[PDB]
């Protein structure tokens, strides 16, 4: 099954733009799923391979209202 | 291309005992993946289909360190 790394790694992955690469760097750089989806786009442009773009698609899809 | 919509249901259905029909009540309770994201096991509990159990398990792979 699943190890804690390998789901926290697919739960990252789940960003626009983030490949496994990334979602490890941007796991070891913030430390926790958690302050990966609360980092600002100031924060998340401060990691290699994000730019002011790509930041603000992550954040538009952590941050936008769930319509079915 | 993924919606937005399938993005935010992919994100959230990579936590542990967590399907798609849970993934969208908690989308659509918290409204946000990062509200989803952020809140304490009480609040994840208020969700009608999460226990304790769920619960629990959701918020320690949310805050629990990345380690390989």
């Known amino acids: ?3 804690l790394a390998e789901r926290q790694r697919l739960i ?3 960003l626009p733009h983030v490949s496994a ?3 490890r760097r941007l ?3 913030f430390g926790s799923v958690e302050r990966v989806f609360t980092a600002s786009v100031a924060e998340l442009m401060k990691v290699e391979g994000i730019g002011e773009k790509i930041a603000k698609e992550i954040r538009r899809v ?3 209202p769930y319509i079915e």
């Open 1 to 3: 099954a699943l190890t």
């Open 12 to 14: 990252v992955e789940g």
């Open 21 to 23: 690469t990334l979602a």
């Open 27 to 29: 796991l070891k750089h």
């Open 62 to 64: 952590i941050t936008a």
